[PDB]
Amino acid sequence: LKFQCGQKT
Amino acid sequence: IIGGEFTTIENQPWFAAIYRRHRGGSVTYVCGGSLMSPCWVISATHCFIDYPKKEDYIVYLGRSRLNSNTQGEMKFEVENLILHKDYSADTLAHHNDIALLKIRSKEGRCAQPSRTIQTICLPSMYNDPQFGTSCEITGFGKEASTDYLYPEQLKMTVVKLISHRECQQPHYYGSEVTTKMLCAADPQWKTDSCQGDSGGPLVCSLQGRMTLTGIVSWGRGCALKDKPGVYTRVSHFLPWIRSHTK
Ligand SMILES: N=C(N)c1ccc2[nH]c(-c3cccc(-c4ccccc4)c3O)nc2c1
């Protein structure tokens, strides 16, 4: 959606 | 990377592959980097020092293989290339080896978020994990120090942060390592970063976040006993980074 630093999905 | 496992970019969505174009038709890999915000990638100045012609570099986001394509990848041009003023190299070490690349797409946009493209977090002013922490390094560099080709698949490995005291031991790197560098090694000197991994990230968890704690910079050999890998201590460059990424 938008960036969330550090998150792998 | 010596050792490690092969991965896909979904496991390192902030990793960027930087290539150089040649007149003749080829594009060759240069260094790795990491995405900090939608328009900025951070890597190492020594990767651009011998050829600071920004128009000749191409940056790719969402790439799991080196020369083939990954669906979802994004290609960028280097809009601004900022190297570090005070960058120096000696017989081994590089000092102030951090660089910034502002990326622009042919349509004029910056990175867009996906399952293969994500930013990594910065640490807070001079805040690091404690030695012992396991961090992971990733990249397309050599698999053996004797190889002359790079892998086609992304690799990753886990290394531990060691203390300056341990790294500055005469029989390690002595005074070549400074307060602005960090050393990371595998307890059993089995896996490490190597030529081809420069500019890529050293990620550890800090206060809950996956943080870019280091940039692959140098090292004597690859996975040699008592020759840790040296990384640029990102926490000590935050002022500089801010100065340009405002
Ligand atoms: N053992 C290590 N931990 C290590 C890590 C990164 C390295 N990078 C290099 C390296 C060696 C020759 C040339 C370059 C280079 C790459 C791109 C542009 C200019 C020089 C390197 O980064 N050696 C390296 C060794």
CB of B222 sitting under 6 A from ligand 1 = yes
Nearest CB to B13; choose among A1, A2, A8: A8
Buried b (16+ CB within 10 A) or exposed e, B39-66: bbbbbbbbbbeeeeeeebbbbbbbbbbb
- Atom 15 of ligand 1, nearest CA residue: B47
B66 with B188, same domain: the answer is: no
B242 with B197, same domain: the answer is: no
CB–CB contacts below 8 A, A to B? 34
Range of the domain at B206: 1-12+120-235
Structural domain count, chain B: 2
B84 with B95, same domain: the answer is: yes
CA–CA gap between residue B115 and residue A9 (Å, rounded): 6
B79 with B143, same domain: the answer is: no
B1 touching chain A per CB within 8 A: no
Mark residue B72 as left, alpha or beta (left: phi above 0; alpha: psi -120 to 50; beta: remaining).
Answer: left
Q: Per the structure block, which two tokens stand in for B188? A: 């059993």
Do residues B109 and B192 touch, judged by C-beta distance below 8 A?
no
Task: Look up residue B193 and give its amino acid.
Answer: S
